[PDB]
CSV table of C-alpha atoms in Angstrom, one decimal:
chain,number,residue,atom,x,y,z
A,1,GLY,CA,9.2,-11.7,-9.5
A,2,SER,CA,7.6,-9.9,-12.4
A,3,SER,CA,10.6,-8.4,-14.2
A,4,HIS,CA,11.9,-10.5,-17.1
A,5,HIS,CA,12.3,-8.2,-20.1
A,6,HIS,CA,12.0,-4.6,-21.2
A,7,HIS,CA,9.1,-2.4,-19.9
A,8,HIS,CA,6.2,-3.1,-22.4
A,9,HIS,CA,3.3,-3.3,-20.1
A,10,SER,CA,1.7,0.1,-19.5
A,11,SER,CA,2.9,1.7,-22.8
A,12,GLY,CA,-0.1,3.4,-24.4
A,13,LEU,CA,-2.9,5.1,-22.6
A,14,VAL,CA,-5.4,2.3,-22.4
A,15,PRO,CA,-8.9,3.4,-21.2
A,16,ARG,CA,-9.6,-0.2,-20.1
A,17,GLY,CA,-9.6,1.0,-16.5
A,18,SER,CA,-11.8,-1.6,-14.8
A,19,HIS,CA,-12.9,-1.7,-11.2
A,20,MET,CA,-9.4,-1.4,-9.7
A,21,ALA,CA,-7.6,1.8,-10.9
A,22,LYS,CA,-4.1,1.4,-12.2
A,23,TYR,CA,-2.5,3.9,-9.8
A,24,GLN,CA,1.3,4.6,-9.5
A,25,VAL,CA,1.8,2.3,-6.6
A,26,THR,CA,5.3,1.2,-5.6
A,27,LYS,CA,5.1,-1.5,-2.9
A,28,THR,CA,2.3,-3.5,-1.3
A,29,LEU,CA,1.8,-4.4,2.4
A,30,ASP,CA,-0.2,-7.6,2.9
A,31,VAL,CA,-0.7,-9.1,6.4
A,32,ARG,CA,-3.5,-11.7,5.8
A,33,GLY,CA,-2.4,-15.2,6.9
A,34,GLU,CA,0.5,-14.2,9.1
A,35,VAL,CA,2.6,-16.6,11.2
A,36,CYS,CA,5.9,-15.5,12.8
A,37,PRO,CA,6.3,-12.0,14.3
A,38,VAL,CA,8.3,-11.0,11.2
A,39,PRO,CA,5.5,-9.2,9.3
A,40,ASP,CA,4.9,-7.2,12.5
A,41,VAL,CA,8.5,-5.8,12.5
A,42,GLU,CA,8.0,-5.2,8.8
A,43,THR,CA,5.2,-2.6,9.0
A,44,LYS,CA,7.2,-1.0,11.8
A,45,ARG,CA,9.9,-0.1,9.3
A,46,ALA,CA,7.3,1.4,7.1
A,47,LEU,CA,6.5,4.2,9.6
A,48,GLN,CA,9.9,4.3,11.2
A,49,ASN,CA,11.6,4.7,7.8
A,50,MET,CA,9.2,6.4,5.4
A,51,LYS,CA,10.5,7.5,2.0
A,52,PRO,CA,9.8,11.0,0.5
A,53,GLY,CA,7.3,10.3,-2.3
A,54,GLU,CA,6.6,6.6,-1.7
A,55,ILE,CA,3.3,4.8,-2.5
A,56,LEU,CA,2.3,1.6,-0.7
A,57,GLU,CA,-0.8,-0.6,-0.5
A,58,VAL,CA,-2.5,-2.2,2.5
A,59,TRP,CA,-4.6,-5.4,2.4
A,60,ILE,CA,-5.8,-6.7,5.8
A,61,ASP,CA,-8.8,-6.8,8.1
A,62,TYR,CA,-7.8,-3.7,10.1
A,63,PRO,CA,-6.8,-0.1,9.1
A,64,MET,CA,-3.0,0.1,9.5
A,65,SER,CA,-3.3,3.8,8.7
A,66,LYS,CA,-4.1,4.1,12.5
A,67,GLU,CA,-0.3,4.3,13.2
A,68,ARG,CA,0.3,5.9,9.8
A,69,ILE,CA,-1.6,9.1,10.7
A,70,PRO,CA,0.6,10.0,13.8
A,71,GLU,CA,3.7,9.5,11.6
A,72,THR,CA,2.8,11.4,8.4
A,73,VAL,CA,1.2,14.1,10.6
A,74,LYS,CA,4.5,14.6,12.5
A,75,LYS,CA,5.9,15.7,9.1
A,76,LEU,CA,3.0,16.6,6.8
A,77,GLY,CA,-0.4,15.1,7.6
A,78,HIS,CA,-1.5,11.7,6.1
A,79,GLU,CA,-0.7,9.4,3.2
A,80,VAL,CA,-4.3,9.1,2.1
A,81,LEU,CA,-4.9,8.5,-1.6
A,82,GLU,CA,-7.5,5.7,-1.8
A,83,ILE,CA,-9.8,3.8,0.4
A,84,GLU,CA,-12.1,0.8,-0.3
A,85,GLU,CA,-13.5,-2.5,1.0
A,86,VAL,CA,-13.8,-6.1,-0.1
A,87,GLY,CA,-15.7,-8.4,2.3
A,88,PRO,CA,-17.0,-8.3,5.9
A,89,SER,CA,-14.0,-7.5,8.0
A,90,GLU,CA,-11.6,-7.5,5.1
A,91,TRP,CA,-10.8,-4.1,3.6
A,92,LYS,CA,-8.3,-2.5,1.3
A,93,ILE,CA,-6.5,0.8,1.9
A,94,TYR,CA,-4.1,2.9,-0.2
A,95,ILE,CA,-1.3,5.0,1.4
A,96,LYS,CA,1.3,7.3,-0.1
A,97,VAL,CA,4.1,9.1,1.7
A,98,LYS,CA,4.0,12.6,0.3
């Protein structure tokens, strides 16, 4: 994947924070060019089995947070940390299980 050696990436506090902020994200959920109904059951596990202080990403053409709200609100409220856009119907959302 991305792990090959020791952690020597984000060592010192670099102020080179470009457009995209280097937040403490854990996983990323991408449902762009989907095929089989596998990705569907995937997101289901996200809300069905949310972890305490988890942080996930969302890259699609629709706000998945729609179902996220009912879940996080059942316990706390919402996993809202960041929201942005990219193109016409393609947007990017940031979610974080508190």
